Symmetry: C3
């Protein structure tokens, strides 16, 4: 058999697991060991987006689940606990396991119970693990997946940073960015029509102040999973190249590629060398996923510019939209205040400020000045002030034809933005009304609901 | 030109074709030959699922079509017959053919006719063949695809077993497991929204008593096709690894991978070495295909357990659901009895028994005992007996909140199972009512139809 | 850094860009240069299909955009102009650029403006470029993508022909082949449900009289892009094989494959050697794309037949359908005449003639004779003449059961063809009525609209 390095030696090792986006240290070991792995399933509400709650099913309290790191030839004694608060039974199938179900039958664990099974890690490589409990698709869709690394006996080459990034497709009853606790939607899941496509279980999980970091000249290894359940990632780094891409434990290594297809349930190790400073975007290049459903993550490189290599500027809201900023905490706060019935004008203003970035600023500018004769101003806009209800219709349904704004004619097209939710339109317009010498007041979600219906 | 091994020598060879999942023997030949291939298109009803009929269009009476095996450098005289019972014209495009349409124009065959054309097999490799008749997508969707192997001149390395597995996506007017003769649905096909995703033309075609077999220590080669028409397979073996994956006649060979993307119209040769006994599941790891639409096949390995490699148990209904069992013949029988108007309580009981596995047993257990205080019993259930109509509502629409069953409180969540068809709910509940000291009687599909509508 | 060939030498080079499907000449240069690239965004209506207009956003007036060809180690001074007629701002992200956004922030260009940035081409390979302006998916969906080749320092091996082919998915409010100016459909785009899947921005862009050409014995290199935004191409050549497939600047080269997966945003260089004459079809082998949404392109090879390799005939309308013919200009003319209110019987006849190929002729024959007792005649058809309204119902809704046509019984199935638009049914039936001694007259789109509604 492969991984024939003899019986376990030394002492039993209690595996130290890490939460995304971090990785356990290299095993740094020349002998096979008995490794004891303890992983606990926890079902809990978390924010899938600002003001959007979801009942996740998690391995270790995170999506993706805790990272497991062992050595080819190790004997793994795998313990799965199911927290007493769980409503569902759970189990595990680890890719890389030699045996039926990858552990599934022997890891069946009711709420408040523990199971264990033992396997030899015969196969080096990076591998997806996931729940294997009927209905399997529901369990995986709710977040039950992670990565296990089985190192080659000599270890992977040294790098400056190792990170853990895992794509998933998610299925909410509500539409993208519709607030509240969103149930799982079985019909969307069966049709492979996700409402969100995410890295690490949430919109913005790896953007802004949650970005990954490295410095010019450093090497970065990323362990990239695709939990699915259903989508295949056109996995891509914007503005860079992968030195290496290696799938699972494959003998093949692709070098010097920017775009690479990761199967549903697949995993790859990618290597990046930082050359010039700025934000490098990991995306699913099935572009509506990346830019309309949340499938973007950032590796931010600090260090000296090299104008001979790249003369240009850091990413901004034109490309990254409302994820250019450190966070959108104001949207969470405004949503909470709406639930509590304490929503203030300033709550709306700060939420709208966050949402205006990219969505509106690409044309109207961050200062609302637009571009005379090309993009009309929102700053001190007579046309806006004259009819706040018209402004709701313009955001939802677009605007075209000749108009006059602050004494100048425009004859252009503002596309409809019907995908914005009632609260988003209300908060954006309240921000605009309370900025740039506009007349103040507020737009409510209910105001926008009425315009959308007629 | 490649395959330049000279003119055909020896005697003309009448190719012996095989039905899935079997493969013709190695050609075992050191000279190029004239190989005569005879393939007949037959249009006929077959069961795509238990009690679900479909009008398949087949090469050789099977989906996928008969397997063709020749040697690089052979001259192939290809004869296509279209059975007189056919309503449609048919033809063939074989991948690996050097020439326009891969044979399409010269193989146009009306019902009751025969065509022939000759090609040299210049290209070694495994290749999809399919019908190439307008509307091409309709012909392929109805099952008109198979594999042709063009061996390298020295032959493939010897293995213990060779099998033939081909994925397809299928488009029925009715939903998944809706009984009766299901028309092709053009609108679902254009939108790439299949109702079934299958190996070898049916649900359960390669599960249970139809599984592929090998023994511990043996090598298994699988010729894997993806007929499409539309889907790309995240092709995966649960609980194992592929020693090798080779696409078409590619120079590249990937080794030691578990998950591999097979394009629509693509084919690969995979190699497996049996290490420990049990069921190894071939899936499309776009998971809702595998677990909600039929895309699972089994390679069952017999032999001695090795607890040092894997301590765990064989697959069961928790993972495989209602395909853990040898077959679901009872569902076919009950459906037939419904059509004939002779449906008995015991017909329903046996159909429900088959469908209860995984679907209900994952939580309620195979004996209906559940888990006190966690999963309420269906065995001798006062709550079930008290209101059979409520039980229909619970299966369709779920149940949550505090309830009392057999003297114990539950406060958990049973998800809705609205995807079950009226007959499936009726048969499952009739099985439960006639098991475990429950009060007997029956639930009808019409009973369930009324609850679903209100 | 890679591409470390020193500072630019010689004179600054003004890059000569080419329109699809042509490629600039090899750079044929042994020193690194400063290359000045000028690319202008133009928003304009073009025909996405005959009689179907679309507002494309283009780099250089074409979809895909102008081809850029430079040498690894070059310093590229990139100038982006946005034509004054533009309504939207635009920018660029070139894959292969080392720097944040691949140029996006520094190339933001309002209508009537110009931007520039400088990058070193460190990375050899074929790369997608695309617009990177919020909403990014909308910009890409409207056609803003192309290819940049960064040659290795020694150049690519010499071939007889180099061509430029780029797949895209498109999202119209109307259905496939519904006439008129079709708006972008955001809801279809978010759901990844394209109405058209095309090579080079239109149906028939590379078919018939727009086919690519080469001769027997010649080598053809194709630079293949996938602009997306959303789809992954099961990229395939019908009746041939790729000698080589190389993705982006990857070290890996696959040889001797026919079917290859191109990620969304991906690019590959493929090599073909012409062996026998005829039409070789480039398709997305997700077959409904290729045969129902426009995803087919032709490389037509002229030269001597070799009956030892392939005895068969050139492609015809059975496989290629209504794209077997040089063009479908008659459909454009008839659509124009309908708009102008000058639609004649002969306008309809010529449009119907073009649309009858494959769609109807596969069964009824190009001469309408059918096959006695198998496919009933449309030529001098008593059954057709007897009830023109029935003929509309038959095309839309199909026909089955026993009928009598010209004295002979038929007992077969004509599938429904509801996907044909009202004008297409009207024009096809007007062609049939005015051919083969049929009674003449005409069917109007309004006639067909009424039958479809009842
Ligand atoms: C460029 C693609 C735009 C984006 C994104 C947004 N707007 Fe816009 N807007 C745009 C144009 C070209 C026009 C004029 C259309 C015409 O008929 O010529 C407008 C118009 C408005 C108006 C009314 C005029 C004014 O007060 O300046 C409002 C109130 C407005 N737009 C608001 C707005 C908001 C809030 C946006 C984000 C949700 C937004 N616009 C995006 C161009 C573009
Ligand atoms: C776990 C995910 C479950 C699956 C799968 C099925 N059931 Fe269930 N069921 C489950 C729970 C946790 C509960 C109690 C909910 C609560 O409010 O606490 C139930 C309840 C029932 C009942 C009513 C109570 C009883 O008689 O025990 C019935 C009749 C019932 N469930 C039937 C049933 C059938 C037939 C299933 C397969 C179609 C099925 N359940 C699946 C948990 C789960
Ligand atoms: C084969 C798959 C067919 C294609 C494609 C089309 N037609 Fe057809 N048609 C076909 C059959 C087998 C039948 C007879 C059905 C039966 O009940 O036996 C028909 C019938 C007609 C008729 C009526 C009979 C006649 O006049 O011959 C008409 C007017 C007709 N078909 C027209 C038609 C047109 C215009 C098509 C392209 C849009 C078309 N058919 C396609 C088989 C097939
Ligand atoms: Cu689970
Ligand atoms: Cu898996
Ligand atoms: Cu056919
Ligand atoms: Cu094909
Ligand atoms: Cu743009
Ligand atoms: Cu890109």
């Amino acid at each position: 058999l492969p991984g024939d390095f003899g019986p376990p030696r030394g002492e039993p090792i209690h595996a130290v697991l890490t939460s995304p986006p971090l990785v356990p240290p290299p095993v740094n070991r020349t002998y096979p060991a008995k490794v004891i792995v303890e992983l606990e399933v926890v079902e809990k509400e978390m924010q899938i987006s600002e003001g959007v709650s979801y009942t996740f099913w998690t391995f270790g309290g995170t999506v993706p689940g805790s990272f497991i790191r062992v050595r080819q030839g190790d004997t793994v004694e795998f313990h799965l606990k199911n927290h007493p608060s769980s409503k569902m039974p759970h189990n595990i199938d680890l890719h890389g396991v030699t045996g039926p179900g990858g552990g599934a039958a022997s890891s069946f664990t009711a709420p408040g119970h523990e199971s264990q099974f033992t396997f030899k890690a015969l196969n080096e490589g990076i591998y997806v693990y996931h729940c294997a409990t009927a209905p399997v698709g529901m369990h995986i869709a709710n977040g039950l997946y992670g990565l296990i690394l089985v190192e080659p006996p000599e270890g992977l080459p040294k790098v400056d940073h190792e990170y853990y990034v895992m794509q998933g497709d998610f299925y909410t009853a509500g539409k993208y960015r519709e607030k509240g606790l969103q149930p799982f939607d079985m019909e969307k899941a069966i049709d492979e029509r996700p409402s969100y496509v995410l890295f690490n279980g949430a919109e913005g999980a790896l953007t802004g102040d949650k970005a990954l970091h490295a410095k010019v000249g450093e090497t970065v290894r990323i362990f990239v999973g695709n939990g699915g359940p259903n989508l295949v990632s056109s996995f891509h780094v914007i503005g860079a190249i992968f030195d290496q891409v290696r799938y699972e434990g494959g003998t093949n290594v692709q070098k010097n590629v920017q775009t690479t297809l990761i199967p549903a349930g697949g995993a790859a190790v990618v290597k990046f060398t930082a050359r010039v400073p700025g934000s490098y975007v990991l995306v699913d290049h099935s572009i509506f996923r990346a830019f309309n459903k949340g499938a973007m993550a950032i590796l931010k490189i600090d260090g000296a510019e090299n104008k001979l290599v790249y003369s240009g500027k850091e990413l901004d809201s034109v490309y990254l939209g409302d994820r250019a900023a450190p966070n959108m905490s104001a949207v969470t706060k405004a949503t909470q205040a709406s639930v509590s019935g304490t929503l203030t004008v300033q709550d709306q203003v700060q939420a709208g400020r966050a949402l205006f970035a990219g969505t509106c600023s690409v044309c109207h500018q961050g200062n609302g000045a637009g571009l005379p004769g090309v993009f009309p101003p929102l700053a001190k806009s007579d046309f806006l002030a004259a009819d706040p209800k018209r402004a709701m219709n313009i955001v939802l349904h677009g605007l075209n034809g000749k108009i006059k704004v602050n004494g100048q004619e425009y004859d252009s097209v503002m596309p409809p933005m019907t995908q914005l939710n009632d609260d988003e339109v209300a908060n954006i317009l309240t921000y605009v009304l309370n900025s740039w010498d506009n007349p103040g007041g507020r737009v409510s979600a209910e105001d926008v609901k009425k315009v959308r219906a007629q």
